[PDB]
Amino acid sequence: SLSPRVQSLKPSKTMVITDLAATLVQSGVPVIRLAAGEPDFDTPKVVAEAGINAIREGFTRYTLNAGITELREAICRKLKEENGLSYAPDQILVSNGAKQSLLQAVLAVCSPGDEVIIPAPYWVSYTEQARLADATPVVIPTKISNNFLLDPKDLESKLTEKSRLLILCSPSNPTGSVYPKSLLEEIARIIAKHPRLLVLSDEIYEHIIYAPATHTSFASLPDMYERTLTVNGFSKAFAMTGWRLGYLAGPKHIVAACSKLQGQVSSGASSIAQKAGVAALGLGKAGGETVAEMVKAYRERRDFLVKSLGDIKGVKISEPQGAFYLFIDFSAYYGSEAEGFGLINDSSSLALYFLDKFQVAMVPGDAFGDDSCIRISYATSLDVLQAAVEKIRKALEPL
Template identity: 65%
Template sequence: MQTVDAVDSTLNPLVANVKPSKTMALTDLATSMKEKGIDVIGLAAGEPDFDTPAAIVAAGIEALQRGMTRYTPNTGTTALRKAICKKLKDDNGLEYAPNEVVVSNGAKQSIWQAVLATCSPGDEVIIPAPYWVSYTEMATLAGAQPVVIPTTPEEGFILSADKLEAHLTPRSRLLILCSPSNPTGAVYSRAALEALADVVRRHPRLLVLSDEIYEYIIYKPAEHHSFGALPGMWERTLTVNGFSKAYAMTGWRLGYLAGPHHYVAAAAVIQSQSTSGASSIAQHAGVTALELGPGGGQPVQDMLHAFRQRRDMIVSRLRAIPGVKLAEPQGAFYVLPEMSAFFGPAAMDRIAAALSPEVYTRQSKKRIITL
């Protein structure tokens, strides 16, 4: 993993304080191993193992054949931003105009630009844990201070209103919520979001970044609710979504940010001086993706069926292991078991008692630990 030398005085101190993405480092390592012929399974990047639906691929090919290969407007094509507005209204109860949407090179860029546009040095960014590894580093790179609030399996990895209130200060600027969650699969109910919204109302300076990239990957009876659709929260919320997870379009690099115009316009300025607009080909395909139907249409529902079967299988196997604590994921494609019972000398004796002598002996402790 490449790191930045913190003592190099020729670098911006903010860069010296930012850690490289562990997700990307492990993904790159797995790719490098595969290129060397090593049989390895990469479980770092959150990437569906399905092909992009055929209709979306055909739209990308059509874009190439029609010569749609030039720069687009910085904030995205009008066709795609209108399609996003329709999607947000129909699926999420969120009303946006096209000039309140910025299309970016992936939801990750949208999140980063939202953080940079709203946070100043000394501000605090509130992040419930467990969390996607980039949230804290984005806050640091903006000069803000990440404030991590732990949640537990017993709480379903859901941030409570009381915990949020206890961690807020006059410097609190941005609360980042991810539902369905990476990496826990937790889904916030409407009641849980309303309780958080009551706290947000009491802190006029606090904004909410709602990361909804896993919105379509959700297991009934759980339901998705957009924070910005709650009463009084539209003005306080920046909604991020994209195409990578639901439509298996990770390599197409296409995401978007929607919110009040002055915040979105600031994010657009940042984008104009960095990457400019997203791929014209991906944007044309994105319109087709949004036209597949509610919930992503049948192709996404087929993927969701497979994800649910996998979720049920891994949950049942983990729960069969004594000592594992597990909040059953309600969405996304992650499972995060709590394994603290297996650490320390006493844990090894419990493992020994649970396994047959053929599988475990005191002489094989080292092997068991490494498996």
Template identity: 75%
Template sequence: MDMAGKEMKCLSERVEGVSTSKAMLITDRAVSLQQSGFPVIRLEVGQPDFHTPTPVSLSGINAIQQGHTTYTLNAGTLQLRQAISHKLKQENGISYTPDEILVSNGAKQSIAQAMLALCSPQDEVIIPAPYWGSYPEMAKLAGAIPVILPTSIDNNFLLDPKLLQSKITPRSRLLTLCSPSNPTGSVYPKELLQHIAHIVANHPRLLVLSDEIYEHIIYAPATHTSFASLPGMWDRTLTVNGFSKAFAMTGWRLGYIAGPKHFVAACAKLQSLVCTALS
């Protein structure tokens, strides 16, 4: 078998080990039942119970009417990346230039591209449980090994730093943190994130993928802290966010990843081959 054949065989085996998104399977079933007239209470996907704000919708309509319907830069329009840069600085306390931001077709694509770009076969991706069902499957798609760390309701389903420390190996490449959490809703307090950051700092190969898509769906007294804003964590963190949840724009498919330029550039290479940013 030639080299190309071996690569195709390896990719085929990798894909065979990946499950179809369970959330989407359930969503498709729910939609089919609704269309058949069955009453369905929808809890399967993170769909806000309000519509896209009117000013956003009108801006979208105006953009279409003005002819802004062509391809954009692969990374997304400069104006949008500048606006995201401003948002992250003002709301999250983290500074990124536009070339350190990549706009994708939703935060889901951003996460998938990050895992594909950062992980090599047999690397380990650490995932606290309960978790969003796509994390381990994305890791498998990259040839990596999901390492699931259980959490307890007694601790609000938050990751135990001692358990994290005990599970890190030389193959540990990526730690996924989702705060506010999907599916538990738990918000990591800043003090706990600082403890986790101290552990990460002692393992130079370990990076953090901080999924912050639910940052605005929290309840007092909880407050959101971006992991990249912690001392020493900017260059170790890829921050993922988007517009789906806070602005009820799930169907608009707009998300982004922000991080050190060399990591974001690797994600952009993947994106350039599979799609063009719709922004």
């Protein structure tokens, strides 16, 4: 029975709480749902109508494996105009979500035994995708005091003959932290010394930024363009998670190998979702007021939760600059008598205590490589956040 690749990954830390509550264990109790990784917003009607018209017009046959020319051309424009990067259409690979885009990159560029350097807190799939490539993940913890930003000295110390891929997610899930250009520059100098090291830049949350923070894409840095794989998509910016559209832009030989890989995984991505993709790219640069209108809401929501929660004692909060996550340091509360949850010294037990006792579902930082925190998503109505703040405050002072 079953192969080692599947056996080697991985219990999962989400189901015990995140979806087990969204179950008859709700009955008859209601639950807030603060653990979803998707926008509360609908798909833009212009984007949605493009999909409806693609269905009507018969754009329902197989696509080119790499993607339709209009989308790969439109993505290239987006990359020059928004990120200041130059790519041709044969350097673009469109996949059914960015998750596939990231995985195919790892399988294309990593030989067995290669080391993939992953900063923690990390998106869950980065560790598992390296293992599916038979590569060795090397995790570098970071601290909240440094805004969960990688330290360049720590990157220097973990370099090896085997270091092949560095994964940078900015703005990042879960911490919602954003890399400054100067920090990425120190990183870049280091990488240029290493002959084999490549960088996977996860820019899926790019248009969700706030305030003085700026998204500066890695390939724009001096000498990095040839070493960088750029990954972006339509799920987070345009609230298109169900459509499954993502893309990779990078060196042509790497994209060509990723494309040959895709011809065997799933073939090309949805013909319907891709036509919606051109429409989404057609909304404009921000892309337009529609995303801007959404980013104003997240900005408002972020500020309510940073204020309320950061004033409870023993709770640490770094102001996030991007995305819609808050990685909250509920540690210090680890002793806790507390109640039915015995020890309450875990991110998982604590997250269990918020649910299954206070009806607030969150994701333990356990899921992301740092047990000091719990991830709270504020991509929900402002009315539910005040109620969630209300449940957290009653949960925590009884300790």
